[PDB]
């Protein structure tokens, strides 16, 4: 039961490997972090593979955007309440998002 309140906002995560349509998928998430996710997973899933044992699996934050830049172009979509619009970033942007989402994911503070 119980009920309180949060609002959030909508964010998109899409993959562009190549330039051909067939290959890239738009995703939708609640918060910015979780979008990243996505991303993030594109290795992880990778990883496990390469790693079973890896129960949480583990390895360069950096060596994981090593796959980001195969890639052909990674972008995402921040809802910003200020104007409810979307601004279309980079996949650098994506790259820090995703290292400061491990980063709290983690601990960080823990409030």
Same mark, same amino acid.
């Given at each position: 039961?119980? /009920?309180?309140?949060?609002?959030?906002?909508?964010?998109?995560?899409?993959? =562009?490997?190549?330039? &051909?349509? /067939?290959?890239?998928?738009?995703?939708? $998430? +609640?918060?910015?972090? /979780?979008?990243? /996710?996505?991303?993030? #997973?594109? $290795? +992880? +899933?990778?990883?496990? &593979?390469?790693?079973?044992?890896?129960?949480?699996?583990?390895?360069?934050?950096? *060596?994981?955007?090593?796959?980001?830049?195969?890639?052909?172009?990674?972008?995402?979509?921040? $809802? &910003?309440?200020?104007?409810?619009? %979307? =601004?279309?970033?980079? #996949?650098?942007?994506? #790259? +820090?998002?995703? %290292?400061?989402?491990?980063? &709290?994911?983690? *601990? *960080?503070?823990? #409030?």
């Amino acid at each position: 039961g119980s /009920e309180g309140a949060a609002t959030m906002s909508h964010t998109i995560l899409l993959v =562009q490997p190549t330039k &051909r349509p /067939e290959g890239r998928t738009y995703a939708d $998430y +609640e918060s910015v972090n /979780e979008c990243m /996710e996505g991303v993030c #997973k594109m $290795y +992880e +899933e990778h990883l496990k &593979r390469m790693n079973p044992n890896s129960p949480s699996i583990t390895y360069d934050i950096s *060596q994981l955007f090593d796959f980001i830049d195969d890639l052909a172009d990674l972008s995402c979509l921040v $809802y &910003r309440a200020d104007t409810q619009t %979307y =601004q279309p970033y980079n #996949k650098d942007w994506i #790259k +820090e998002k995703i %290292y400061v989402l491990l980063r &709290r994911q983690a *601990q *960080q503070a823990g #409030k």
